[PDB]
Amino acid sequence: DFSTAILERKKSPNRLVVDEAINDDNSVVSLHPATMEKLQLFRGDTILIKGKKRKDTVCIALADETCEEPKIRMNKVVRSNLRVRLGDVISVHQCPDVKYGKRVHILPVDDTVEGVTGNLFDAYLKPYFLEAYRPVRKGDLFLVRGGMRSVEFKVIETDPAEYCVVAPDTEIFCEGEPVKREDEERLDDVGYDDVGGVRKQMAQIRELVELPLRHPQLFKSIGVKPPKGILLYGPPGSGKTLIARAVANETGAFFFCINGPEIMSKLAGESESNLRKAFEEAEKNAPSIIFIDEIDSIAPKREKTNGEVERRIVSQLLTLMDGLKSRAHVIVMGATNRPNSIDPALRRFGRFDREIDIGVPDEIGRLEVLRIHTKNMKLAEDVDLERISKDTHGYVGADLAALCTEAALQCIREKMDVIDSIDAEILNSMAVTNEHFHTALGNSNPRETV
Amino acid sequence: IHTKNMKLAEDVDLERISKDTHGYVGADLAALCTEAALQCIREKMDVIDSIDAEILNSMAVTNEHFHTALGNSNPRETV
Amino acid sequence: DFSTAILERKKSPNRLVVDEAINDDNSVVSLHPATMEKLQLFRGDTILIKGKKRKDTVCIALADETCEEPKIRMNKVVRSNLRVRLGDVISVHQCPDVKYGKRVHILPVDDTVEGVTGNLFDAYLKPYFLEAYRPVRKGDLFLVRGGMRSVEFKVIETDPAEYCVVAPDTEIFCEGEPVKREDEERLDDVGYDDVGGVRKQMAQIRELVELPLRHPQLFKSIGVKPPKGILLYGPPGSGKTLIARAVANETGAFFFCINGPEIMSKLAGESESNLRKAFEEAEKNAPSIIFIDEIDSIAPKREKTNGEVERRIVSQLLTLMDGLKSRAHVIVMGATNRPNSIDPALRRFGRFDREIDIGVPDEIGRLEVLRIHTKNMKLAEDVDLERISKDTHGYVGADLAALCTEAALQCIREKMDVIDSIDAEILNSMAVTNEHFHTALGNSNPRETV
Ligand SMILES: Nc1ncnc2c1ncn2[C@@H]1O[C@H](COP(=O)(O)OP(=O)(O)O)[C@@H](O)[C@H]1O
Ligand SMILES: Nc1ncnc2c1ncn2[C@@H]1O[C@H](COP(=O)(O)OP(=O)(O)O)[C@@H](O)[C@H]1O
């Protein structure tokens, strides 16, 4: 039949799976060269991608031999501008009517420009569009990095209408009161691109969570019950909380965070009531991820429990895990730096079945972490992030994140004298030097045996 | 027991898996089957959406799916 | 002056430093493309390299952007055929008179063909020269891998005389009694190419030893005293003994091996006499490397010493280390799997100043080790050494080496029925399958915390 032929032909090489981008560019999508040959698209060509919630965007298509044939590489900005997530399916369409822009009206989002002063054009939009020939579509939201922060901007209007390429003859209008956020999450929200040095561990977590959280109705047909509990192990500041938030944001899963001390600070009975209500809310707003931080505060070993009501909380957690069904679509993530202090009853089948060890990052892993916390920072040529990673042996994710923030403050004090209060165009121009990173290394507070 | 509702390839050797899975309890072996089952779902099925019965009944779990499940497993007796 | 102008012009781009080869080929040397442009040599061209002891060879020159401009990449066979070692200087010269071979007489070395039977041509030389167009020079020695071993062959004669390229019309003569080894070390001797999974650790050791052992007269002019003692740490079978033999062979240093139990098995007084004589011999035959294996057998902690004559041996070792001078050109290498059981007095400045931790190899490091012990083995396409390294988590160098030898025996039994005794042409044809590696994995006897 007519409509049946439409729906069954949804296996066209024009329908591709959303994958991660190697190069973080808001205007560039990467495809396999055999896929672009099938779809008759040339490198550099602007394509129209249609996503979910009847939303669409225009991007530069680029050939990548590392990109899978049925997949498409796109960054978090492009992904959001299509109302999609990694693993979803979009359809790529030819875009031959992309005329250069006559004038574009762009405004920032208030929650990203809190405290920011001065002209946003010279600090952000000017170097952003400069000789880049960026495709721009009305209603889009993009992220610009620089000046110790990141600003989110909205495309208010385009001339010609709906979409145009921002050329050197395009007038960029960015005056007026910042726009207020509406039905869209922050582009600065933590994603997989914000977690470094745990490539293997991230892939493992992703495999376990993506199917139950992205396709929950799939296990209704299959008789296979997926994992419920995952135990993240690793020293403090190794990104356990980060990985959890990244996974929840990237999956669209409802994120409920239980904190070990937060539960244990409450009265007798109030801690278990809070513990139940946390599990209840997650089931109601499922697909969900319950993140139990410092899980050793709650549920320690029966030897280390020197309290009557404390043993009542360990038992409450075990039964909440047992009482949780696969059909509930809730994944519980526990985190501890003391895996051997945790009660062994949690490791039981039906509770915390799988365990991921997030150790200390190696030279390569540290360089990745250093790149993440220098994203919104202007760096000098005298800066060598490869050399810093070579020296910072025994540093965790937080130790490296603190080194960047300290080198950033050392740069603020050293370069800026009396202002009062700084404006964006001056913050975006000051560069963090190797001397600022050396000074931060000298005042730092950061081992592995067989 | 945990391959009863599963289509298995001729390349599958449950005798060889039992020879290798020394120190595995009932749950460890049950988890190995469910993991090899999911590895088969992902590897064989691309984009459906949601699967229907006649297609699920046709996909066979291979020795490669059981090898991949063995590589990611978390399983002693003295006198 | 005339002869002064010759000697001072020894900074010609034709004089290059001997570096390691990425690709192990007895006929190929790699140079930088800017160096070949300076020397007017094209890729594929046969060049004449002159080394030490008035020795020379002919190789295929190839362009490599990873090769340093003043360096040359060559394997251990080419290196030996020039009487040179890594770091030495050779001179590359144009070779335009390389005519194809009419006939070459090649014979194996006895110590490599012990127990081997059948025609060596069909098993080794035939697939070795096949469509390879190998430059061959008289007096040369080369290594051919296959049939669970490696055979060393000598180039007895060439037609045209001295050197020729072995083409498909070249007659290869290999009949007669094997030649006896003369003034040349075994090509199967352990080298840096035989040690895998310790890239960073090897580079560290090499930097510390190469200058004092390759250029000992250099520190006579400089007032800098180099390291004497190095402590290698790591579990049993992680290649500590291997690294020591590799370093000694690659440097040409005299190798004296002290064994912890060997010393401790001797009578009271005989152990210290042996310990002194070991240090004395090394000084006499210097540049030398003293390798003290199981250093914790000798010299354990003063608490763990429950013997009077045992404490006399620990003290003997400390004074022998103190009594050793930089001017002696002897480097002492200690090895232990129990670094915390070793006497802390050894770690003192003047004794064991530097410490190298050779841990357990990662997925990449294990794959390297697997490649090393499959060098002389025929492998099926069904073999996936990448997958074996993925599975063999927690395996050390010896564990992986044993897995190969077991899969090799499993192949011998499974493929060969009743022979008696096997000959070379049949051994070279039998391939080790993934089933042989699975069977070896099933019968194996192989942890890291923060
Ligand atoms: N793997 C990492 N990559 C990048 N940043 C990291 C990483 N690990 C930690 N950080 C940074 O340091 C902080 C450490 O806090 P956290 O995630 O709570 O660590 P943990 O939960 O392991 O104790 C994070 O908020 C993040 O900004
Ligand atoms: N890093 C390695 N690469 C390759 N082979 C190795 C490695 N480590 C060990 N082996 C192999 O296994 C054997 C282990 O013995 P050994 O070198 O004495 O280990 P260790 O001294 O650390 O106890 C070596 O002879 C070698 O054949």
Short mmCIF file of C-alpha atoms in Angstrom, two decimals, chain C residues 2-401:
data_model
loop_
_atom_site.label_atom_id
_atom_site.label_comp_id
_atom_site.label_asym_id
_atom_site.label_seq_id
_atom_site.Cartn_x
_atom_site.Cartn_y
_atom_site.Cartn_z
CA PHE C 2 94.67 18.35 3.30
CA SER C 3 93.99 15.52 5.82
CA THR C 4 92.59 18.08 8.36
CA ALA C 5 89.99 19.19 5.71
CA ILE C 6 88.96 15.49 5.26
CA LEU C 7 88.46 14.89 9.00
CA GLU C 8 86.62 18.20 9.66
CA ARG C 9 84.24 17.63 6.69
CA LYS C 10 82.98 14.46 8.51
CA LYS C 11 79.76 16.52 9.07
CA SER C 12 78.47 15.67 5.55
CA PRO C 13 74.74 14.79 5.20
CA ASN C 14 76.16 11.38 4.07
CA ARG C 15 77.21 10.66 7.72
CA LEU C 16 74.10 9.50 9.70
CA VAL C 17 73.32 8.08 13.19
CA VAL C 18 72.11 4.44 13.54
CA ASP C 19 68.50 4.30 14.86
CA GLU C 20 65.91 1.46 15.27
CA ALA C 21 63.76 0.18 12.38
CA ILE C 22 59.95 0.43 12.53
CA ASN C 23 59.63 -2.34 9.86
CA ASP C 24 61.85 -5.43 10.45
CA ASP C 25 63.35 -6.15 6.99
CA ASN C 26 66.98 -7.36 6.53
CA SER C 27 67.22 -5.53 3.13
CA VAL C 28 65.51 -2.17 3.90
CA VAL C 29 66.98 0.98 5.55
CA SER C 30 64.78 4.04 6.23
CA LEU C 31 65.85 7.69 5.82
CA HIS C 32 64.12 11.11 6.06
CA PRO C 33 62.81 12.42 2.65
CA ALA C 34 64.79 15.71 3.06
CA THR C 35 67.98 13.67 3.77
CA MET C 36 67.46 11.54 0.58
CA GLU C 37 66.88 14.81 -1.37
CA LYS C 38 70.23 16.17 0.01
CA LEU C 39 71.97 12.83 -0.83
CA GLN C 40 70.16 12.54 -4.23
CA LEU C 41 68.69 9.07 -3.51
CA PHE C 42 65.27 7.92 -4.66
CA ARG C 43 62.87 5.55 -2.84
CA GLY C 44 63.56 1.92 -3.79
CA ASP C 45 67.17 2.73 -4.82
CA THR C 46 69.88 0.34 -3.56
CA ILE C 47 72.51 2.20 -1.46
CA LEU C 48 75.92 1.12 -0.15
CA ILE C 49 76.34 1.69 3.62
CA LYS C 50 79.83 1.48 5.16
CA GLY C 51 80.19 0.67 8.81
CA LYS C 52 82.99 -0.29 11.22
CA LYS C 53 85.84 -2.89 10.95
CA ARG C 54 86.11 -1.95 7.19
CA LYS C 55 82.71 -3.81 6.73
CA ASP C 56 79.86 -2.71 4.33
CA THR C 57 76.41 -3.76 3.00
CA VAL C 58 73.82 -2.91 0.30
CA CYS C 59 70.21 -1.98 1.27
CA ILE C 60 66.98 -0.57 -0.26
CA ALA C 61 66.61 3.11 0.80
CA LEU C 62 63.07 4.17 1.82
CA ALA C 63 61.51 7.55 2.77
CA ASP C 64 60.15 7.94 6.31
CA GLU C 65 58.82 11.27 7.68
CA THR C 66 59.04 9.80 11.26
CA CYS C 67 62.81 9.15 10.76
CA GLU C 68 65.01 12.00 12.07
CA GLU C 69 66.93 14.08 9.47
CA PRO C 70 70.47 13.19 10.83
CA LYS C 71 69.50 9.55 11.57
CA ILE C 72 68.96 6.20 9.69
CA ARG C 73 66.49 3.42 10.62
CA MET C 74 67.95 -0.10 10.34
CA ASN C 75 67.12 -3.53 11.86
CA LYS C 76 69.51 -5.71 13.96
CA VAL C 77 70.60 -7.79 10.88
CA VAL C 78 71.72 -4.65 8.88
CA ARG C 79 73.34 -3.25 12.07
CA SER C 80 75.39 -6.49 12.59
CA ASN C 81 76.27 -6.70 8.86
CA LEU C 82 78.00 -3.28 9.41
CA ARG C 83 79.71 -4.12 12.78
CA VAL C 84 77.77 -1.18 14.33
CA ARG C 85 75.28 -0.62 17.20
CA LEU C 86 72.40 1.85 17.81
CA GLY C 87 73.85 5.35 18.17
CA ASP C 88 76.97 4.73 16.00
CA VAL C 89 77.70 6.62 12.77
CA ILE C 90 77.75 5.10 9.29
CA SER C 91 78.18 6.72 5.88
CA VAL C 92 75.65 6.22 3.07
CA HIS C 93 77.01 6.06 -0.48
CA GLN C 94 75.42 5.85 -3.95
CA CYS C 95 75.21 2.29 -5.36
CA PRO C 96 74.52 2.36 -9.14
CA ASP C 97 76.41 -0.87 -10.08
CA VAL C 98 73.92 -3.40 -8.63
CA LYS C 99 73.33 -5.94 -11.37
CA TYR C 100 70.84 -8.83 -10.93
CA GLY C 101 72.26 -12.11 -9.63
CA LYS C 102 73.32 -14.91 -11.97
CA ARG C 103 73.99 -17.31 -9.03
CA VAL C 104 74.34 -17.00 -5.22
CA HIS C 105 75.78 -19.60 -2.82
CA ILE C 106 74.05 -19.41 0.60
CA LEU C 107 74.69 -21.76 3.57
CA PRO C 108 73.17 -21.88 7.11
CA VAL C 109 75.12 -21.53 10.41
CA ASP C 110 75.34 -24.84 12.38
CA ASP C 111 74.22 -23.45 15.77
CA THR C 112 70.87 -22.37 14.15
CA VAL C 113 70.20 -25.65 12.23
CA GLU C 114 70.68 -28.08 15.21
CA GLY C 115 68.04 -30.81 14.79
CA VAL C 116 66.65 -29.27 11.56
CA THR C 117 66.13 -31.63 8.55
CA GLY C 118 64.96 -31.45 4.93
CA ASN C 119 65.59 -28.85 2.20
CA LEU C 120 66.21 -25.37 3.69
CA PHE C 121 65.44 -23.70 0.34
CA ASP C 122 61.70 -24.59 0.14
CA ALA C 123 61.23 -23.86 3.86
CA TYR C 124 63.28 -20.63 4.26
CA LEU C 125 65.20 -19.05 1.28
CA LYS C 126 62.44 -19.56 -1.39
CA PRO C 127 59.66 -17.43 0.34
CA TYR C 128 62.39 -15.07 1.68
CA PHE C 129 63.71 -13.85 -1.72
CA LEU C 130 60.41 -14.38 -3.71
CA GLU C 131 59.56 -11.16 -5.71
CA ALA C 132 61.46 -9.19 -2.99
CA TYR C 133 64.52 -8.30 -5.23
CA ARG C 134 66.87 -8.37 -2.24
CA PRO C 135 70.33 -6.77 -2.44
CA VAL C 136 72.90 -9.37 -1.39
CA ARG C 137 76.56 -8.82 -0.44
CA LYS C 138 79.22 -11.60 0.05
CA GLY C 139 80.11 -12.39 3.69
CA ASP C 140 76.71 -11.14 4.94
CA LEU C 141 74.60 -12.99 7.48
CA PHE C 142 70.81 -12.87 7.57
CA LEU C 143 67.91 -14.30 9.58
CA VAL C 144 64.86 -16.13 8.19
CA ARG C 145 61.83 -16.86 10.47
CA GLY C 146 59.44 -19.82 10.26
CA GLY C 147 58.75 -23.37 11.49
CA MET C 148 58.85 -22.59 15.27
CA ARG C 149 62.46 -21.26 14.94
CA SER C 150 64.83 -18.89 13.08
CA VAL C 151 67.73 -19.94 10.80
CA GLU C 152 70.89 -17.81 10.30
CA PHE C 153 72.36 -18.03 6.78
CA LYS C 154 75.72 -16.79 5.34
CA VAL C 155 76.25 -15.38 1.82
CA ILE C 156 79.21 -17.54 0.63
CA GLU C 157 79.45 -16.19 -2.97
CA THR C 158 77.70 -13.87 -5.50
CA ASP C 159 77.73 -13.67 -9.32
CA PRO C 160 78.46 -10.86 -10.30
CA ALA C 161 81.22 -10.69 -7.61
CA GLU C 162 80.91 -9.05 -4.14
CA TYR C 163 77.24 -7.85 -4.50
CA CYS C 164 74.08 -8.47 -6.61
CA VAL C 165 70.24 -8.24 -6.38
CA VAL C 166 68.55 -11.68 -5.92
CA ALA C 167 66.02 -11.67 -8.84
CA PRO C 168 63.63 -14.50 -10.06
CA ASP C 169 66.29 -15.53 -12.64
CA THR C 170 68.97 -15.84 -9.84
CA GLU C 171 70.05 -19.40 -9.04
CA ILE C 172 70.18 -20.01 -5.27
CA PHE C 173 72.72 -22.68 -4.25
CA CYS C 174 72.32 -24.03 -0.66
CA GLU C 175 73.87 -27.52 -0.50
CA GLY C 176 76.76 -28.63 1.67
CA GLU C 177 77.67 -28.84 5.36
CA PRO C 178 76.51 -25.89 7.53
CA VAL C 179 79.12 -23.19 8.20
CA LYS C 180 80.61 -22.75 11.72
CA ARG C 181 80.12 -19.40 13.60
CA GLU C 182 83.19 -17.06 13.53
CA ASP C 183 83.71 -13.69 15.41
CA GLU C 184 79.97 -12.77 15.09
CA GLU C 185 77.21 -12.93 17.76
CA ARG C 186 73.90 -14.81 17.20
CA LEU C 187 71.25 -12.83 15.21
CA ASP C 188 68.60 -14.52 17.42
CA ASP C 189 70.20 -12.85 20.52
CA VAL C 190 67.75 -10.79 22.54
CA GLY C 191 67.43 -7.14 21.42
CA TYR C 192 65.11 -4.15 22.05
CA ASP C 193 62.77 -5.64 19.35
CA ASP C 194 62.23 -8.67 21.69
CA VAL C 195 60.96 -6.54 24.68
CA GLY C 196 57.31 -5.41 24.50
CA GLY C 197 54.89 -3.41 26.64
CA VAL C 198 57.61 -1.31 28.35
CA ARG C 199 58.14 1.54 25.78
CA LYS C 200 58.53 4.35 28.42
CA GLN C 201 60.64 2.19 30.80
CA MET C 202 62.96 1.06 27.96
CA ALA C 203 63.56 4.66 26.81
CA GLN C 204 64.38 5.63 30.45
CA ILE C 205 66.91 2.74 30.89
CA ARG C 206 68.44 3.44 27.44
CA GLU C 207 69.04 7.15 28.25
CA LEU C 208 70.82 6.22 31.53
CA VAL C 209 73.01 3.42 30.11
CA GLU C 210 73.75 4.32 26.42
CA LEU C 211 75.97 7.33 27.19
CA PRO C 212 78.15 5.64 29.97
CA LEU C 213 78.43 2.31 28.04
CA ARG C 214 78.68 3.53 24.38
CA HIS C 215 80.82 6.64 25.10
CA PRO C 216 82.80 5.77 28.30
CA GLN C 217 85.78 8.05 27.44
CA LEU C 218 83.32 11.01 27.16
CA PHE C 219 82.94 11.35 30.98
CA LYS C 220 86.74 11.55 31.32
CA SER C 221 86.59 15.07 29.74
CA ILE C 222 83.26 15.99 31.49
CA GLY C 223 83.31 16.29 35.31
CA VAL C 224 79.86 14.61 35.51
CA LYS C 225 79.70 11.15 37.18
CA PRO C 226 76.84 9.07 35.69
CA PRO C 227 74.52 6.47 37.40
CA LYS C 228 75.94 3.16 38.63
CA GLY C 229 72.97 1.23 40.03
CA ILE C 230 69.45 0.75 38.63
CA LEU C 231 66.66 -1.13 40.40
CA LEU C 232 64.14 -2.87 38.10
CA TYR C 233 60.77 -3.57 39.85
CA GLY C 234 57.93 -5.80 38.67
CA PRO C 235 56.15 -9.17 39.07
CA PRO C 236 57.87 -12.47 38.04
CA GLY C 237 58.04 -12.97 34.26
CA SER C 238 57.64 -9.23 33.45
CA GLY C 239 60.94 -9.27 31.48
CA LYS C 240 63.43 -7.82 34.02
CA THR C 241 66.15 -10.40 33.04
CA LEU C 242 65.16 -9.85 29.35
CA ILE C 243 65.51 -5.98 29.51
CA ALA C 244 69.01 -6.46 31.09
CA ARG C 245 70.19 -8.91 28.37
CA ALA C 246 68.63 -6.69 25.66
CA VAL C 247 70.43 -3.57 26.96
CA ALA C 248 73.80 -5.44 27.26
CA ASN C 249 73.54 -6.97 23.74
CA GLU C 250 72.42 -3.66 22.14
CA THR C 251 75.31 -1.74 23.82
CA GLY C 252 78.05 -4.36 23.34
CA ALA C 253 78.61 -4.20 27.13
CA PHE C 254 80.08 -7.27 28.88
CA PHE C 255 77.22 -9.10 30.61
CA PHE C 256 77.87 -10.68 34.01
CA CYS C 257 74.87 -12.23 35.70
CA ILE C 258 74.73 -12.63 39.50
CA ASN C 259 71.81 -14.79 40.63
CA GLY C 260 70.36 -14.32 44.15
CA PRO C 261 69.82 -18.07 44.87
CA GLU C 262 73.10 -19.03 43.05
CA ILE C 263 75.12 -16.82 45.48
CA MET C 264 73.06 -17.92 48.54
CA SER C 265 73.40 -21.69 47.63
CA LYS C 266 77.21 -21.44 48.18
CA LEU C 267 79.02 -22.01 51.52
CA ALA C 268 79.83 -19.30 54.11
CA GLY C 269 82.62 -17.16 52.63
CA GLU C 270 82.29 -18.74 49.17
CA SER C 271 79.19 -16.51 48.51
CA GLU C 272 81.11 -13.26 49.26
CA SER C 273 84.23 -14.49 47.33
CA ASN C 274 81.92 -15.15 44.31
CA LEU C 275 80.23 -11.77 44.86
CA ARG C 276 83.66 -9.91 44.83
CA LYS C 277 84.97 -11.93 41.78
CA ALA C 278 81.78 -11.01 39.86
CA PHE C 279 82.40 -7.26 40.45
CA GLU C 280 86.17 -7.73 39.68
CA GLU C 281 85.51 -9.51 36.33
CA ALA C 282 83.03 -6.76 35.26
CA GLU C 283 85.65 -4.02 35.97
CA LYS C 284 88.31 -5.99 33.98
CA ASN C 285 85.99 -6.54 30.95
CA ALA C 286 84.32 -3.05 31.18
CA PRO C 287 82.17 -1.35 29.71
CA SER C 288 80.03 -3.92 31.60
CA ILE C 289 76.54 -4.59 33.06
CA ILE C 290 76.28 -6.59 36.28
CA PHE C 291 72.81 -8.08 36.53
CA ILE C 292 71.78 -9.14 40.03
CA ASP C 293 68.68 -11.28 39.59
CA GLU C 294 66.36 -11.87 42.60
CA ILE C 295 68.38 -9.15 44.47
CA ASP C 296 66.05 -9.75 47.50
CA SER C 297 67.70 -13.24 48.02
CA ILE C 298 70.97 -11.42 48.69
CA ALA C 299 70.54 -8.03 50.48
CA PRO C 300 66.98 -8.36 52.07
CA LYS C 301 65.83 -5.95 54.91
CA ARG C 302 67.74 -6.10 58.27
CA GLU C 303 64.48 -7.39 59.92
CA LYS C 304 64.09 -10.28 57.39
CA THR C 305 67.78 -11.29 57.96
CA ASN C 306 67.59 -14.16 60.46
CA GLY C 307 71.25 -15.16 59.90
CA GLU C 308 74.71 -13.89 60.92
CA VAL C 309 76.56 -14.75 57.64
CA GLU C 310 73.49 -13.42 55.71
CA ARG C 311 73.97 -9.90 57.13
CA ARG C 312 77.68 -10.24 56.13
CA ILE C 313 76.56 -10.71 52.47
CA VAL C 314 74.18 -7.64 52.49
CA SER C 315 77.12 -5.54 53.84
CA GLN C 316 79.47 -7.08 51.20
CA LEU C 317 77.10 -5.97 48.40
CA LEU C 318 76.81 -2.38 49.80
CA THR C 319 80.63 -1.95 49.99
CA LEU C 320 81.13 -3.46 46.51
CA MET C 321 78.64 -0.82 45.19
CA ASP C 322 80.46 1.95 47.19
CA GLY C 323 83.90 0.68 46.07
CA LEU C 324 82.76 0.81 42.41
CA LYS C 325 83.93 4.01 40.65
CA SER C 326 82.36 5.86 37.63
CA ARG C 327 85.82 5.53 35.93
CA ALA C 328 85.30 1.66 36.06
CA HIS C 329 82.52 1.89 33.36
CA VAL C 330 80.29 -0.72 35.08
CA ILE C 331 76.51 -0.37 35.47
CA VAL C 332 74.84 -2.58 38.10
CA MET C 333 71.24 -3.65 37.43
CA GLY C 334 69.23 -5.14 40.28
CA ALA C 335 65.91 -6.93 39.85
CA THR C 336 63.18 -7.82 42.38
CA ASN C 337 59.43 -8.51 42.48
CA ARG C 338 59.48 -7.47 46.18
CA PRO C 339 60.78 -3.81 46.23
CA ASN C 340 59.59 -3.35 49.85
CA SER C 341 61.54 -6.46 51.08
CA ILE C 342 64.85 -5.08 49.73
CA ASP C 343 67.23 -3.40 52.25
CA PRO C 344 66.67 0.43 52.19
CA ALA C 345 70.49 0.99 52.31
CA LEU C 346 70.67 -0.10 48.59
CA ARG C 347 68.53 2.94 47.52
CA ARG C 348 71.32 5.29 48.86
CA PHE C 349 73.13 7.76 46.54
CA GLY C 350 76.22 5.97 45.21
CA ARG C 351 74.55 2.54 45.16
CA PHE C 352 71.12 2.08 43.46
CA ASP C 353 70.36 5.80 42.66
CA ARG C 354 67.64 5.14 40.04
CA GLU C 355 64.55 2.87 40.15
CA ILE C 356 62.42 1.69 37.17
CA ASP C 357 58.97 0.12 37.74
CA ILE C 358 58.10 -2.41 34.99
CA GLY C 359 54.45 -3.15 35.81
CA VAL C 360 51.90 -5.37 34.04
CA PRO C 361 51.38 -4.66 30.29
CA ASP C 362 48.12 -3.07 29.08
CA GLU C 363 46.03 -4.23 26.03
CA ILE C 364 48.50 -2.47 23.63
CA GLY C 365 51.57 -3.79 25.51
CA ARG C 366 50.21 -7.37 25.51
CA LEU C 367 49.59 -7.25 21.71
CA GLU C 368 53.30 -6.22 21.30
CA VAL C 369 54.40 -9.22 23.46
CA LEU C 370 52.10 -11.54 21.42
CA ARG C 371 53.70 -10.33 18.16
CA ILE C 372 57.20 -11.16 19.56
CA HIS C 373 56.41 -14.83 20.39
CA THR C 374 54.62 -15.52 17.05
CA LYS C 375 57.62 -14.22 14.94
CA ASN C 376 58.82 -17.76 14.09
CA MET C 377 55.23 -19.11 13.91
CA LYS C 378 52.86 -19.51 10.97
CA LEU C 379 49.50 -18.00 12.00
CA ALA C 380 46.09 -18.54 10.40
CA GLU C 381 43.83 -15.64 9.24
CA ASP C 382 41.39 -16.98 11.90
CA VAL C 383 44.03 -15.82 14.47
CA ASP C 384 43.31 -12.41 16.05
CA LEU C 385 46.26 -11.34 18.29
CA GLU C 386 44.29 -8.10 19.01
CA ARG C 387 41.42 -10.20 20.50
CA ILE C 388 43.84 -12.39 22.54
CA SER C 389 45.37 -9.20 24.10
CA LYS C 390 41.79 -7.97 24.86
CA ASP C 391 41.10 -11.24 26.78
CA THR C 392 44.51 -11.84 28.49
CA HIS C 393 43.98 -9.06 31.07
CA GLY C 394 46.33 -9.55 34.06
CA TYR C 395 48.90 -11.53 32.04
CA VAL C 396 52.63 -10.65 32.25
CA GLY C 397 55.25 -11.12 29.48
CA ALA C 398 55.98 -14.75 30.48
CA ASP C 399 52.24 -15.63 30.70
CA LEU C 400 51.77 -14.44 27.10
CA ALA C 401 55.05 -16.16 25.98
#
